[PDB]
Automatic annotation (TrEMBL):
This is Cathepsin B-like cysteine proteinase. Disulfide bonds join C15-C44, C27-C71, C63-C129, C64-C67, C100-C133, C108-C119. The modification Cysteine sulfenic acid (-SOH) is found at C30. The gene is cb1.1. Residues 2-251 form the Peptidase C1A papain C-terminal domain. The chain holds residues 88 to 340 of 340 of the full protein. One of its GO terms (molecular function) is cysteine-type endopeptidase activity. One of its GO terms (biological process) is proteolysis. Keywords: Disulfide bond, Hydrolase, Protease, Signal, Thiol protease, Zymogen. Belongs to the peptidase C1 family. The modification Cysteine sulfinic acid (-SO2H) is found at C30. Thiol protease. Has a role as a digestive enzyme.
Amino acid sequence: EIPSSFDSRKKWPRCKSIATIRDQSRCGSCWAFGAVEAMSDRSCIQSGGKQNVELSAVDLLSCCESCGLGCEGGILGPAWDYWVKEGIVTGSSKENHAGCEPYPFPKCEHHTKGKYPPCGSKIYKTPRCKQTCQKKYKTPYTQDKHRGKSSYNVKNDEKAIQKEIMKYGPVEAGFTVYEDFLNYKSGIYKHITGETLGGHAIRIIGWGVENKAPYWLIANSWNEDWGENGYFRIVRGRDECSIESEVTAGRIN
Ligand SMILES: *[C@@H](C(=O)N[C@H](C(=O)N1CCC[C@H]1C(=O)O)[C@@H](C)CC)[C@H](O)C(=O)NCCC
C-alpha cells in the first residue's frame, strides 16, 4: 500500500546524500546531476549504508561518450548504463573539494535571488575526461569507481513510480521545462505560461498532498537558494510536463 506521503530523507537518514542539494553551475549538466545524486542515494540505500559516497558529477559529465553533449545537455539512459559498465568515482562540490574528482565549476544563482554570483547567460565548455584523482586523495582513479548492476526505465504509471522510489530509493526523471519554471519560488508547480526551453532532469525523492492537491517532491540541481531550499513540488498523477514519462534508475545488486 502506498502511503499519502513519502520522503526518502526520512526513510534512509543514514545516507547523507539524500538530503544534499547540488549546483550544476553554468553548464547544462542537469542530466549528470540527477544521475549521480540518485546513484549516490541508491548506492548507500541498497548497500545498507556501506557505500557512503558522493559520486562525481564531473566524471560522468566529462567521460561518458554516449550520454550526449555534456554542458549542452545529455541523455538519461546512457548515463545509468555508464554507471553500470564503467562506474563513477567520488567527488564533491568545488567548494568542498572532497573525493577523487570534485566539480570544477562554482555555485551561482539560477534565475533567482540570493547570495551567490548570478549564473548569467554564458555556458562553460564540457570539462575534459581527466581520469585522475586530486592530489590529496590517495586512491587511484580506476580504483575509486562505483558501479551499478542494472539500469532501467521505470514504467510511466504513478503507482509504479511510487513503489520504485519507496523500495529502491530516489529516481532520476526528465520533464519539459517551460519559461515559467525559471520563476518558481515555492508551491506546487504546473505549467501555466511561457514557451518550452527543452528538457530538464531532476531527482524525485518522494511525494505528498496538500489541500487535496497531490505532488511529487523533487530535488533540483540549482543550489539551496532556488525554490524550496533547493527542492520543488510538481503536480502528480497527470503526467504534468511529462514528469511521469521519463523516469530512469538502477540498482547495485
Ligand atoms: C538540463 C539542463 O542542464 N538544463 C539547463 C540548466 O538547468 N542550466 C543551463 C545553465 C545553468 C542552468 C540554468 O538554466 O540555470 C537549461 C537548458 C534549463 C533551462 C540539460 O539540458 C539536459 O540534459 N536535458 C535533458 C534531460 C533529459
